[PDB]
């Protein structure tokens, strides 16, 4: 069973945004077979219908999900579920080439970090205690925006 990779890693993108699924191959958008053979599936200028369950095969390999939003701030995330010690990237993303300022991340309610300009979270050693509901506050064109919340959960395993 093959797995499906996303570049960039973010399973949540904005409209018009691109993304590339990597995996003589068959693709399965929503369940329907896509007219793509290549091991890598291309997505130019995303539309909303580009949302939904994706999966590939050469033995059929399980599903990855892609949400498409239009908004001011999208809290992108590396993975929605991680296993301890694995990398986790968080990213408070702003509409297009737009600049998000005074960005603050919140984890479970508390102020995780604040910076003048935009910044991102990066943990090479995903701590099991990191599981929380995240969201990010930003400032676009002088105006205030709160990001949609995103649940994230690590898994410690013997």
């Amino acid at each position: 069973k093959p797995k499906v990779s996303l570049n960039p890693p973010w399973n949540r993108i904005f409209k018009g945004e691109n993304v590339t699924l990597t995996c003589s191959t068959k693709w399965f958008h929503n369940g329907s077979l896509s007219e793509e053979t290549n091991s890598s599936l291309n997505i130019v200028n995303a539309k909303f219908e580009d949302s939904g369950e994706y999966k590939c095969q050469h033995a059929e390999s399980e599903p990855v999900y892609l949400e498409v939003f239009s908004d001011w701030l999208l809290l992108q995330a590396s993975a929605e579920v991680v296993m301890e010690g694995q990398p986790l990237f968080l990213r408070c993303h702003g509409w297009r080439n737009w600049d998000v300022y005074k960005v603050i991340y919140y984890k479970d309610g508390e102020a995780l970090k604040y910076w003048y300009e935009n910044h991102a979270i990066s943990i090479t050693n995903a701590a099991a205690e990191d599981s929380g509901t995240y969201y990010c506050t930003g400032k676009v064109w002088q105006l205030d925006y709160e990001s949609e919340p995103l649940n994230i959960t690590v898994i410690k395993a013997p």
Binding site: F14, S70, D71, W72, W95, R96, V140, W141, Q142, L143
Partner: protein, 290 residues
């Protein structure tokens, strides 16, 4: 065979290190105009602040500002009056659309019985494109006819309006009115609602007062009412601008009204009317003073 005036504003300069003065002078240079009667109006962000009147000459008018006031990024205009004018602000950044949505006047609602809610959209890029504005009733029933008036503002922004007429009963029975702003710039659509205010009501109390120059001064203390939504006017029906009124402040709430009326109006006779939702009889309390 005259010649209009040339209007430019000079401002205080900065520290050698680029810091702002404590106070900031604005110097208005009205120059090269045919000797006549010239009157200079000073506009803070669309509002009068000062006025003078002087009578191929030139003339100067000066306005002074708190360093704070100045740093407020408000837009001051010099308006020489036919009209000529120059305007300046703290040298600057872009700012996205805001959208406000009014509730009807308790007066507009019961007295005039012709309620209107208004959707206001500001800080629009005039080049961003065109702004669609759209009304809708929570219920589903079709809206009436919305009057859309625009006014390209002095500070370079677009300010779109759309006043929608509303049914008293529809309103009174808890309808919800939606205003939906779309634009090529915006990643989504702005959306503002307004409905009859929840919470317990309480009718107002009123008090017309009178003071000891030789012009008039009259006050009014409308208090203890329980939706902030109130309307105040002075009759004799004297104009809605011949008096001033404070914002409501929880005490219930309260408002002051200041009506200056010439001792000549002292020679004819007045009335302080409070048009409030909870107010008993015709939805109006009121009093008077001699």
């Amino acid at each position: 065979d005259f010649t209009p005036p040339t209007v430019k504003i000079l401002q205080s300069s900065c520290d050698g290190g680029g810091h702002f003065p404590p106070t900031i002078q604005l110097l208005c240079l009205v120059s090269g105009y045919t000797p006549g009667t010239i009157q200079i109006t000073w506009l803070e962000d669309g509002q009068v602040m000062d006025v003078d009147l002087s009578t191929l000459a030139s003339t100067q008018s000066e306005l002074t500002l708190s360093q704070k006031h100045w740093l407020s990024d408000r837009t001051y205009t010099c308006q020489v009056t036919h009209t000529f004018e120059d305007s300046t602000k703290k040298c600057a950044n872009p700012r996205g659309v805001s959208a406000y949505l009014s509730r009807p006047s308790p007066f507009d609602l019961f007295i005039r019985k012709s309620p209107t809610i208004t959707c206001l959209v500001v800080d629009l890029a005039p080049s961003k494109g065109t702004v669609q504005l759209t009304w809708s009733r929570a219920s589903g029933k079709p809206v009436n006819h919305s009057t859309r008036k625009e006014e390209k503002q002095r500070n370079g922004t677009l300010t779109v309006t759309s006043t929608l007429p509303v049914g008293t009963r529809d309103w009174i029975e808890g309808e919800t009115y939606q205003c939906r702003v779309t634009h090529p710039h915006l990643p989504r659509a702005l959306m503002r609602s307004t409905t009859k205010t929840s919470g317990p009501r309480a009718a107002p109390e009123v008090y017309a007062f009178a003071t000891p120059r030789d012009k008039r001064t009259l006050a009014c203390l409308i208090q203890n009412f329980m939706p902030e939504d109130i309307s105040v006017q002075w009759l004799h029906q004297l104009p809605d601008a011949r008096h001033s009124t404070t914002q409501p402040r929880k005490t219930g709430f309260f408002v002051f009204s200041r009506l200056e009326v010439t001792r000549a109006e002292w020679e004819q006779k007045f009335i302080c009317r409070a048009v409030h939702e909870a107010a008993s009889p015709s939805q109006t309390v009121q009093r008077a003073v001699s």
